Each structure stands twice: as C-alpha cells, then as structure tokens.
Design a protein around this ligand. Sequence first.
Ligand SMILES: [Ca+2]
Ligand SMILES: [Ca+2]
Ligand SMILES: [Ca+2]
Ligand SMILES: [Ca+2]
Length: 348
Amino acid sequence: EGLDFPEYDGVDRVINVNAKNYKNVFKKYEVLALLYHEPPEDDKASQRQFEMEELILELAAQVLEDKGVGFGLVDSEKDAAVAKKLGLTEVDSMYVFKGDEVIEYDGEFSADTIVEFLLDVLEDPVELIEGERELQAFENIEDEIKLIGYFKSKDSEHYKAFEDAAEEFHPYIPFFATFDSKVAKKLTLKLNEIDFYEAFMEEPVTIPDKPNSEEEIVNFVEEHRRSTLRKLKPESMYETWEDDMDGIHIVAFAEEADPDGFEFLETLKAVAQDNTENPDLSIIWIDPDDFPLLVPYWEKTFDIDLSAPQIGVVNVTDADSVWMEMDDEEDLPSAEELEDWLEDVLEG
Ligand SMILES: [Ca+2]
Ligand SMILES: [Ca+2]
Ligand SMILES: [Ca+2]
Ligand SMILES: [Ca+2]
C-alpha cells in the first residue's frame, strides 16, 4: 500500500482572536496572519463566502504549522477593541505580523499565494551577495523593482539604515547588499552607494546624497514605486490595479512561455524603455498562465482570445476597453506600431 500524498486533515487551526486571548496569541507565534473582517451578512451567500475564506486560511495554516506561522480572525464588530490596539483599519484585509513589524497583504486570497507570501515573509529582508551564483541571480531579476547597496560590513551604520528600509517594503521589493569590493566593482558601486533598478530596465538610478538614511531610501522607493512596465502578480494584484493613471490602464496579455507571447513581451520592454521618462505612463503585463481562473472572464469581458498576445486600454470604472487588432498570419506589431496605436487611442 503506497503512502498517500498529504491532504487537508479537517483539523481547525485558525484562531478566533478576541480581547481575552490576543495578547497570548501574539506571544506564541513569531509570524501571525490575521484576517480583519466584517461579520458575514445573514443571507446564505454571504455565509458561504466567509466559509470559503476561512477554509482557505485553514489550508494555509496546516501547511505552515511546522514553521510556526499562526492564523487568526478579528471580527470588526465583536473584536473592535482588538482591531484598534493592533492598528487594523482596512476591513476584509489580511495583516501579517512578524515580531515588531506589520505587513499588509495586497494579493489574491488563495492558499497558494498566501503560503508563498508568508514563506517570503519568513526570510531575512536583505539578501547578501557573496558568490557568483548570487550575483548572477541578482542580474537576472527583471520583472520587479530591485535595490543593491555596497557597504563596509553588516555593522556599518549605513547598512543598518539600508536594512531598516528593506523591512518597510518586505517582502514585496527585494533589497540586496554586498560587502565585497570585487562585487561592487562589477556593479559599479561606490562605498555606501545604492543603485535602484526600475522593473524591466537595464540602467539603474543611483539614490542621491549618499550615504543614505533610512528615510532617504524609503522616500526614494515610494517616489519611484510605479515602473513604466509592471507585471501583474497574484501576491500584489490589487495594489497594482488600484494605481491607475487617471482612470485607465494599458493592459498587455502575453504568455511568456509562448514564442509569440515572448516576442511581444520583448517589444513591450522596448516600448517601456523608450518611454521610461514619461511619468504618467503605466503598462500592466498580465501573463494569463498566472491567472487561470480569470481567463474565461477576461476572454468574455474583453472579447479577445488569450491564446494570442493582446494589448488594449481598460477603463477601471466600468471595465470598458478597446483592444488592438492583430492578425496572427503576419508579424506582430513593432514598438513603433504599438506606440502609434496607443497615441491614437489615448488622444481621444
Ligand atoms: Ca476573533
Ligand atoms: Ca555605477
Ligand atoms: Ca544622505
Ligand atoms: Ca520608467
């Protein structure tokens, strides 16, 4: 008899966090994920929706039990006093507490993404570059903002300020550091210098006025928080989509694992690089392979075939959209053709 794969065991591990136990709960767990939620309305549908959300947390709780991650619920009415003491303000959101750090979760509510997120939370906020493999891994990061600094040692005042700033964006924005002058020469970094890499960009921008305090780094990252080309990721999809440019998003569908999707993606990078100075411009790359449960909805709402690359303009108010025509029997449009089509659409 072969041993079974792991399965959900039906044992309840999600804690009802209330005024009587919330102090004891925070002492038991190093990392604690709390769902701050309104009580479900009396209709059956609202109870089923909450029933689903709680079981998703139960699954994540079973997977992360051995690593010491706790899961809890905070009722916005029954536990209003707990919400005030913990700083839980945005209802129906999940808050992650890692010691004396509070991390808000801005992603899809599924066991997959929540578990991957919390595993990232558990890691140290700064990743150290020592060997060639670590340096090569840093250079190959392109689908997200990244920062790298060169400091004298882990005990440098300027590294500790860099580490304090990394905790503010943990674990969404990767922070990298080196204390090796050879690695710093390969990255063209002076001592206490921090290079900021916009997503999908080759040239970094140096944070000015080095050495940088924690506040200088935090102010710089927030000011450059929106890259010209951004990828929609499950762990941060709601944050990205709410940062629209005056009510619209330019949306591009491209399956990276597909040869046409890959070619179209390389064109999108060229478009973004050629317009990287434009502050208002926001292009969102969606890989439909990352969101299989939304593909039927997207194909119906936008009247497009996601088996092929697509690009359009979406109105965030009503989901009204317009999508560029592309005939697959010929070459995909060049960056010049894409820029031309976007100009005419946006001119209206
Ligand atoms: Ca509770
Ligand atoms: Ca440099
Ligand atoms: Ca400074
Ligand atoms: Ca840019």
